[PDB]
Design a protein around this ligand. Structure first.
Ligand SMILES: [Mg+2]
Ligand SMILES: [Mg+2]
Ligand SMILES: [Mg+2]
Ligand SMILES: [Mg+2]
Lengths: 130, 130
């Protein structure tokens, strides 16, 4: 889910500051994810690790921010500066949340058969959009 | 296309003010479109007609405003007030443009046969998203 719906605006800015600290400290190039565990009892955050790559769940962030993370990666490696139009990335002050998103992966894991993936011929596939 | 890319902000707001006048004067209920001709040589606008219904091109407007027109039609006819969360519609001050969109209708009209629509069984259909 993006953003995390149980966070206050304060917790949201707290986490963002920690992540910029980590990214700067490692002179990070490209897209990466800084992972925390939050103690639901206390509200405390604890850094766990950095995933130094794009992730399967990037899509929820693209939809609520409007920023294509893959084109951003390509422009960054072409030498573009974040905040210039040719980077595809706004300056921080122009990055905003717009709404909420969730994402799910649909698989052939059969819930009625202990999540063993099913296999074989798909006889019909019609997606739903809108 | 939404918004109209050849317009300035000032033009955009002039047009909005005319449209709100028409809507209010007709006590309009639901979704409607106020259509204008704009003279490309002078920048002058001219009211042509109101289309008193949703239109095929509503989709570009939805994507750049974030507002579901069809849900809004439904809440409005349920009696909701625009501006309340129940209406699915923000107050005017909270309605804003976010980026740019265009819509293309894919049809069986054959450019190789004077746009006569083709017909028959579709043997393969795979859309593209992202
Ligand atoms: Mg991890
Ligand atoms: Mg890991
Ligand atoms: Mg017309
Ligand atoms: Mg007409």
């Amino acid at each position: 889910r993006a953003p995390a719906p149980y966070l206050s605006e304060a917790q949201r800015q707290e986490l963002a500051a920690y992540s910029l600290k980590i990214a700067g400290a490692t002179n990070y190039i490209g897209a990466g994810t800084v992972e925390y565990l939050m103690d639901a009892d206390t509200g405390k955050f604890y850094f766990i690790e950095v995933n130094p790559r794009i992730q399967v769940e990037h899509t929820v962030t693209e939809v609520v921010t409007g920023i294509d993370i893959v084109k951003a990666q390509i422009h960054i490696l072409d030498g573009a500066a974040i905040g210039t139009p040719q980077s595809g990335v706004p300056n921080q002050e122009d990055i905003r949340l717009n709404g909420h998103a969730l994402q799910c992966r649909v698989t052939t894991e059969d819930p009625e058969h202990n999540f063993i993936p099913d296999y074989g011929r798909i006889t019909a596939y019609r997606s739903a959009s809108g």
